[PDB]
């Protein structure tokens, strides 16, 4: 019923941020019309406010960015992938709870 | 970040709807890597047009209700207007030829 204000990545900027800059972040691979993605979106927007510059919160549209989707061998949507220092650190799928995402952020920031 | 004039909801309505301004509006957010790439494309282009064609921006955190109206998925998005019509949009990173071509289609 609504809008999403996460920064939308194409392959290039994904490469820049996750690989070149080694940004500590999460990336939701999603589709525009996905009902579950629509439930997960607000949870990530709310979390972004808690970690403003310390951790990135990005979005990849898998219909536009098919190469990236397939780079990760992903087979469903929504999925949230976690990165720090250019490494792929973790992944969760489906209707996540903020507890789960928060713990992963903390696990990631710590290594 | 340079020439791009920031609009609040009130001014966005006055220009686009009450006055029918021909313009583009970049919907954006602070600390946005992709926004940082898109802004200089628009600033460079701006030089090629008279002030009759607006180049504007809106901060989605400040103009929440406005942004929600269009139910956009992701930032940045650039939306194009003329004579009070909403001519269309493009989303995420853009090249200058996409913007130029859209501007020409809007103006014709």
TrEMBL record, chain A:
It comes from the Bacteria. GO terms for molecular function: protein-disulfide reductase activity. PROSITE patterns: THIOREDOXIN_2. Pfam families: Thioredoxin (PF00085). Belongs to the thioredoxin family. This is Thioredoxin domain protein. Disulfide bonds join 34-37. Keywords: Redox-active center. GO terms for cellular component: cytoplasm. Residues 4-110 form the Thioredoxin domain. The keyword Cytoplasm does not apply. The keyword Calcium does not apply.
